[PDB]
Amino acid sequence: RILPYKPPEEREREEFYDLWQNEEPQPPNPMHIPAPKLPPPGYDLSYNPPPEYLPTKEEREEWEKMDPEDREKDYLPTKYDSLRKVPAWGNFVKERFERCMDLYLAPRVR
Amino acid sequence: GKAKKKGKSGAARNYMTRTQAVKKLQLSLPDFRKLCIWKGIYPREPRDRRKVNKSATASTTFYYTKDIQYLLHEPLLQKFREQKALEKKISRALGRGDVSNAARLERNANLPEKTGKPRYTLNHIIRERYPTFQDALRDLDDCLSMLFLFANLPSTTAVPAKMIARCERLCHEFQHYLIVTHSLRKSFLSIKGIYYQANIQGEDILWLVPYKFNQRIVGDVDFRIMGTFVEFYMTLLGFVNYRLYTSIGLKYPPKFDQVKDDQGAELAAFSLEGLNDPSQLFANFTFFLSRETPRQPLEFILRAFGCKRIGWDAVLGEGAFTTDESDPRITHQIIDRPGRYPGRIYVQPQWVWDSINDEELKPPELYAPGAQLPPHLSPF
Amino acid sequence: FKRAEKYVKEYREQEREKIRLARIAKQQGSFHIPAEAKLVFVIRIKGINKIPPKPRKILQLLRLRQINNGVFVKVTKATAEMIKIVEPWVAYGYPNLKSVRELIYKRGYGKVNGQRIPLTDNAIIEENLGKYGIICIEDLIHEIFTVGPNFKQAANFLWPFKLSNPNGGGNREEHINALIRAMN
Amino acid sequence: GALKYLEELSKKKQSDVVRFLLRVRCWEYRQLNVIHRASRPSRPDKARRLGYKAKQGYVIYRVRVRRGGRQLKYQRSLRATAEERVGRRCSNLRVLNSYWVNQDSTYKYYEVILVDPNHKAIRRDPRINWICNPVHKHRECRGLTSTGKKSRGLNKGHRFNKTRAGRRKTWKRHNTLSLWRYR
Amino acid sequence: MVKWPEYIRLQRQKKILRMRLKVPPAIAQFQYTLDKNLAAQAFKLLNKYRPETKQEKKERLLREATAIKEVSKKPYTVKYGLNHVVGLIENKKASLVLIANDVDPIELVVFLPALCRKMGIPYAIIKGKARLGTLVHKKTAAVVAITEVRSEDKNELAKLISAVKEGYLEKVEDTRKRWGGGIMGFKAQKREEKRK
RNA sequence: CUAGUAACGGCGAGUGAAGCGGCAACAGCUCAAAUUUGAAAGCUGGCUUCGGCCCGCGUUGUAAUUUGGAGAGGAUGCUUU
RNA sequence: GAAUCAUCGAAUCUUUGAACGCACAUUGCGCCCGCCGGUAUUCCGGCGGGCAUGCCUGUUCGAGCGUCAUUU
Known part of the structure; x- marks a missing residue:
């Protein structure tokens, strides 16, 4: 009835199943509105776009002069000759955190 | 003839404010917010906010009656009261000075810092939220994007190094599922990072893997809210990864060596046992990544397309082909610098991504080193 | 206000360390290690509030002042005795x-x-050093794993690592590599 | 043996240490309710001697009763009036016994031991499971406590002839005309 | 002005009455407890002789049971319980006795300082019956005692026995016999002058 | 049955027992006051595959031993489950 | 397997009444949870389970310079 003794260091040595085991189709209720997925990555998101997609240096300066969150696009394309010249994205985590409040703090309208 | 009030009848019965929902649930505001992430509760918009509440503002958020009633009957709400009393019991033995009673009560707590497995069990909530495996793959889009982003980020109080070590272990396990089934189709290079598209059961999954560098995290970010997102997605990851391995017949969880993982094998330590156009691309080819090229995004791609023999530098990893560059077995070396053996083709990692996207063997003469690269295109 | 409890303890720790420090200089500064040059990652952990003056100069030399910092060093017959002073x-x-x-x-x-x-x-790396043979971070990464002559500047370039405090996770040969995983 | 010391101290109750305690407690008990509750007995030696245990199902209640006459005298004792007022308050419990705790010029203060017949610790214990039986409902109302046995004259001897089995039963026996068949 | 709750006022008025009324020497000696240094040194020794809790006693019995399937000395713990402790001090088995100052029926400990002084065991009076229950692994302990310690710290108890004697016992010697009271404030002094 | 006796009384009216003896029926016990102190050994819950887990009560005392025509402790050797 | 049959271990059991959401001389007036029908996420009607007081044990929440510890 009773397990014998194991010393507590050996207890620290000591310390998956199918969710859809019986799966049936379920009709979705019309009130629940699913979240809209993110757009697919466009041509201009690439680190080496065609040179017709270059803006010149004036609106790069004009981009940095005006305040953030006043932009139609949070990005403009850049040119990089090699992947080692490409740095990490500066505001990636802030964008994903803004997606979090887009996912659970900003409402959906059907 | 009966008199009925406009305040008590109408949209006020249907929609309820956030403050009224919190007071009804008798929970704290972070507790109510966390339960909304797990259960998928959503504020939505009423048709007329004035009809819902006469004293109301557009900045205020409302809620539906039915999903609030689900939160009232949530077993997690019962589990929150049990965990709160248990957290009071942890400070009991600390206050008494009872070290042994503190050791066992934290062991009864099963706190996630020392375990890595999430604190609460949400198998029933995930089952209620996702009715089909296709919807799990649809939410795997943001799940894998969350997983690889927060696997690159360092450890904090909300996300300890144990949970990232579990995250990078399970992310490679899902990657090992992809390289067995050859599921990856499109790879995309971008300033934000590297995008990947793979097809599973007729469903496409997109995720973004930033470059392995130092990403600044400072500002106003809540580590608790990204922590509960990871905890929800980690539980969704484990049951999906168990389903996919049992679907293909490979055993789950796969075995691994801690010595190889500590020595830097990464993708090489994870050995997968079968029993408890993509393949034709580099069907019989040898690859050698140099020290500059990113090993982790490259190794994911060519193993997904079934290339057999790949090596890299000793300082880049462990458990690979021979490190020395004098071996003539290698055909294509991936170099990116600003030997020169005639038997070895010298080519750039940009050629790798273009050849995966086009699947037409783009010429290495055009992608020769020391020359300006052609503009690559987005497959989407 | 501070008690005579702490005064006697502080003077007891000071005489114990001074004897051990003067033990060390009076004896031969030789460690039971092979003479082959190796590499150490070394981490400051708070030992005692008061500090003696010979380690005062040498901890500023390792810029190891703040709580729970780390830095990479290369052992010599010199650097061993620097390490063989600052143990606690x-x-x-x-x-x-x-x-x-x-x-x-x-x-x-x-x-x-x-x-x-x-x-x-x-x-930024090339704007900082540029002309020392380094080309990216992985060049510095390789420079750490195998020591070159330019490691002296790479140590000087690298700030001390302000790691996070662990919640409970002299010489330890593999246990510090367990300590980095517990507290990074 | 701390309760032997308490027994000797309770005997000496006009002395300086105890009269101080009886003064400060009477002030506190006066400003509390009439039929308030006590978490622990104020006299643990008297509670122990009378049957109180530190077990779930045993509670203590404190009662203040007005002192004086009813020159008609109320034949019910002030302890019997105290016991009747707890039972009408704690109607789910059974009055075990009671004891004196304090005095004033206007009030007398008693502490009453109650036993819960519906707890499981009480029904399991054969030393107190007798009070679980339905004969012992409201013992204080029938004169079945130590106060009631005193006021009913339930002693033995020539001195207690009229009341040693109940005076109403004895008066019925002594006033009955017994007629037999073969008279 | 505002109205306080009834139990708040009653427990606050119990403060003023205790400090105003002059107290007989049996209860007045409980107002003189020991200092911060002697408490920490006493509890340093006493923590070393804590009893075993329900968890590590159940594991220790599980030790000897599974070994019997497949040699001990006398345990030394701090002694507690009133009738157990006063039985020990009546039999001169106790070395040091530590008494709480806040036993709600004070009579349960009011004979303890005289009984310890008659029998010859040195005693002390400490703040907190909750602090003694911490040592005991109970909620509250009215009194604790030490009978015998291991030979590792026979010297530590002897120095604590002396430190309790010359630091607490020969300082309250005159205040054992003398009454309490005499903490009258400015409002009480003006009221007494008006009454007289 | 004692006994309309003793005893009490505008000693008028009156009131009014009991021990003994013969029967009927019979049956004895539990605490508090003790230090288990070489080990709170006691008990309520609610979680369970039910086999045993925690929470609390409780040392200001829950079990065992003992209740003054007794008893405890040692020793002692038979007899009981 | 009849019965204005007997037995009786399973059910049903309207309003009241110690009478228990409020009122009562009206088949009325409120709140929490769920369901159904009729234009129906908003309107109406109906139905189901609940909502008295004193006290006991536990659970949980709160207050009190009542009160203890907290520089190793």
């Missing part, structure tokens, strides 16, 4: 490739103009 406040051990590559990637800070900036661009 530091932990010394041989790193592994996974431990070192993560630590700079998760936390990489550089020193220019007396400023602690992150490691955001490899173009």
